[PDB]
Design a protein around this ligand. Structure first.
Ligand SMILES: Nc1nc2c(ncn2[C@@H]2O[C@H](COP(=O)(O)OP(=O)(O)O)[C@@H](O)[C@H]2O)c(=O)[nH]1
Ligand SMILES: Nc1nc2c(ncn2[C@@H]2O[C@H](COP(=O)(O)OP(=O)(O)O)[C@@H](O)[C@H]2O)c(=O)[nH]1
Ligand SMILES: Nc1nc2c(ncn2[C@@H]2O[C@H](COP(=O)(O)OP(=O)(O)O)[C@@H](O)[C@H]2O)c(=O)[nH]1
Ligand SMILES: Nc1nc2c(ncn2[C@@H]2O[C@H](COP(=O)(O)OP(=O)(O)O)[C@@H](O)[C@H]2O)c(=O)[nH]1
Ligand SMILES: Nc1nc2c(ncn2[C@@H]2O[C@H](COP(=O)(O)OP(=O)(O)O)[C@@H](O)[C@H]2O)c(=O)[nH]1
Ligand SMILES: Nc1nc2c(ncn2[C@@H]2O[C@H](COP(=O)(O)OP(=O)(O)O)[C@@H](O)[C@H]2O)c(=O)[nH]1
Ligand SMILES: [Mg+2]
Ligand SMILES: [Mg+2]
Ligand SMILES: [Mg+2]
Ligand SMILES: [Mg+2]
Ligand SMILES: [Mg+2]
Ligand SMILES: [Mg+2]
Lengths: 5, 159, 159, 153, 156, 155, 161, 5
């Protein structure tokens, strides 16, 4: 529920 | 004299930029929406000497003693404007109260690249009575007025 | 019985002991070994009250039961003044708390050899609310005032 | 199409903390100031596509002379750094940008005045970064490219 | 006919002031761990006097004028002035010794010790203040010359 | 150059240092060791003139003396004559400039009326002000008025 | 942006640097080593504009004495040799630039001294014999110190348009 | 990291 792309 | 405020919102709206332009005084080019300290600053609020121990939340002790919430959306967004109930009810969900001091402010009104007209950013805010302002941390517009006006909302609720 | 367990953090050569042993033993310590730390103590008629300062003149190289810490920099330094965050966040890290009673004092204000204006020595202390004073063990300035104002900060935190 | 940048500065300022935050994306809690690789990354720099092959030196087109706003020694070491860069390139006009790192800290002494009239004493841009926030972190390197573009044309 | 001393820390420019006024050129580097008793006549201030100077590095009894010097691109040095103020008053066991606090190396743009500090401190003894930089020969001679005025004063 | 060498005499507990250090170093000394005394100094734009106050904050154990009592004392106010005659005794003169001031007048716990703190001051001609280092009241005017007394005695 | 590359030519002992270091570094240079010459600079709110004075006290040097957009040819008003080296540094400036129309301003420096011989007449008819403006500076005073540099920019601006 | 110098 975060990460990057 | 002192108040412990919170700033809820989505990523990319300006949550910290308001906390770090009213407090630390300069447009934060980019502040990671993934970290949150419990910032603070004393100011000569409204003929009064008060301490704004804020919190730039990014999804204890505060999200309970949140005396006034800065539920904020972006005027060049849309999903963030639509996210405020999941932020509107969240604030009411924890506090289990239908009357919590809050102020819906519209951030980043400095952009001409905007879609969310003032109507939206009113009839929504008129659907909680709670005040509305239009901020932009690149300008320091209603930046202090959003926080200041929240204080009036706290003072009221108790008395 | 009324007591308080206090700690005195800071760099070497600022005056950590000079405060501990001018308030307690009552004379300007020309020099005290910065590589030792005893847990000094003394009863004083603190504020219309009878309290026992079990201080600790720490030097690193207790700090759990630290009721009120005395994080102290030098006004004729700057390295000691930039170590505040690294002595600040230390105190928060151990107590795993963002609200621990403290007072940042500016020691050795008796020198005209001074650089750290009271501005920096306030905006920083204002950036945790916590009080500020300007001591000088050669004079016994806010020496006692520094320790006494920590007691109030302890009294507050509980109630 | 690329640019070859360098990052000079003292120990304890945050030379690498910038250099790995903007390239590898995370605040390096502590990077041993005794090593230096020639880092690189492609980014859509400013309406253009360029490759920032950098080098955070520790003891060439655009240097990143960097001091710490919570320092003083590093701030006063900039001539020993601003002459060094001029000394190598035997040129009195080499593109650079003096940035003030780690402005996230309230334990700060170097006011923005110093961190301007000094930068204004070469014209070269000034920003204030803090690799714990990614503030002007990219802005510092991004602005350096602008300084490279100028000098040619 | 004056015996002067140049007190200061390492890295301020203690030697740079003694060898640019006397030997006339910017000393690219002087090994501070050494100290001669340097001298030079100059037509000081409408008068003919001999500057038998001393670039101390840690006379200290006949030091008629101490050139207590800090670096405007330092701070540890500017803070040490008390450690050097009291030194001079300690030896001479006197709270009134002719001296002049000068801010050396004002030529560098990396300056933090503003002229305010470099005055209210100097104002806290009355004793004059100047701003030298041996790369320029600015108040370099002015610092030594004005010390002479302070020696003449104390006597009369 | 223009200067004045002043001395601040009085008992312990009045605030001899609180006036020296609030005029000069600018902040209420919450407490000053009454067993120390430096010959403090400061340049100020005294009275349309550029004069240097090289003061002295004596505690025992000169051009103008600042003989001072506490308005919330009585022992300190009754040592004036002994601090008086001390000043006369050294300068072996009955006409030395000074100014008797009443310090710590910021306190309501006061007993020494302005009457006493005048009839006594009127019994040497020399002025009288009421200072309080917590406020910076006549603090400077106490020292400033001394300079005029020095200027007078000369010409 | 808005930049201007200026040069300060003159003899030794007039105060070429004193004007460069009083306008920029803001204090009277009691004595500056005449054997050195850096390319000083400073941003100022010039004349309803924002301009950058990269100056050069002469005593890259090709790069400047070649794009010296405006030269500050300066004599001392308590001199005469420096005032006679007028024709030697102005032919110099028009030699390199191979131009008889180079923006410049002849200033009379050190007009603070009562020991002056070069009347304002000389210090006009000569400046009138290139049209270029004249002012009277003194770095210990900051008189026309900035006025000399500011008026040079006007001459740079004009020459183009 | 104790030292005297
Ligand atoms: N150029 C650029 N600016 C960005 C980018 N992401 C964020 N920003 C800027 O940073 C702000 C959004 O991040 P921010 O609002 O501080 O995160 P939050 O306050 O925690 O919600 C916006 O005002 C943007 O101007 C990006 O990818 N590129
Ligand atoms: N002998 C000596 N004393 C110093 C030095 N630097 C500071 N002091 C004095 O030492 C006094 C108290 O020492 P302190 O700083 O309390 O020891 P520490 O706090 O454990 O490092 C201060 O009031 C200073 O004035 C020094 O280099 N040598
Ligand atoms: N892991 C760790 N990091 C620290 C500590 N103290 C400071 N830091 C951080 O580590 C960074 C120092 O590394 P850095 O300055 O990048 O090394 P340099 O640029 O090569 O000199 C600073 O930015 C601090 O924020 C510590 O005790 N432990
Ligand atoms: N730029 C530069 N200057 C240096 C270097 N090494 C030494 N110096 C100079 O060496 C001088 C220190 O020696 P000096 O001041 O004459 O000795 P002192 O009089 O005893 O303090 C300074 O003025 C520096 O300018 C170097 O590597 N680079
Ligand atoms: N710690 C402490 N400080 C005191 C006490 N009484 C007075 N002081 C401080 O000492 C200051 C007065 O200095 P003063 O007595 O006038 O100097 P002196 O008259 O020459 O000894 C007052 O302003 C108080 O702040 C006391 O009982 N304890
Ligand atoms: N009386 C006197 N004045 C001097 C002497 N040497 C230099 N000066 C003064 O120092 C100033 C030097 O100006 P400066 O800017 O260094 O000349 P520049 O290098 O040609 O630009 C002049 O205005 C002179 O009045 C000297 O031996 N005697
Ligand atoms: Mg954020
Ligand atoms: Mg200690
Ligand atoms: Mg490194
Ligand atoms: Mg030496
Ligand atoms: Mg006393
Ligand atoms: Mg010159």
């Amino acid at each position: 529920l975060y990460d990057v792309a | 004299t002192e108040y412990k405020l919170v700033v809820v919102g989505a990523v990319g709206v300006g949550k910290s930029a308001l906390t770090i332009q009213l407090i630390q005084n300069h447009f934060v080019d980019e502040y990671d929406p993934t970290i949150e300290d419990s910032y603070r600053k004393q100011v000569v609020i409204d003929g009064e000497t008060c301490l704004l121990d804020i919190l730039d939340t990014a999804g204890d002790q505060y999200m309970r003693t949140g005396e006034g919430f800065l539920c904020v959306f972006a005027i060049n967004n849309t999903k963030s404007f639509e996210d405020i109930h999941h932020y509107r009810e969240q604030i009411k969900r924890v506090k289990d109260s239908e009357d919590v001091p809050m102020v819906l402010v519209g951030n980043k009104c400095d952009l001409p690249s905007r879609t969310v007209d003032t109507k939206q950013a009113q009839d929504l805010a008129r659907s909680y009575g709670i005040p509305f302002i239009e901020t932009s941390a690149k300008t320091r517009q209603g930046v202090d007025d959003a926080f200041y006006t929240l204080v009036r909302e706290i003072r009221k609720h108790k008395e």
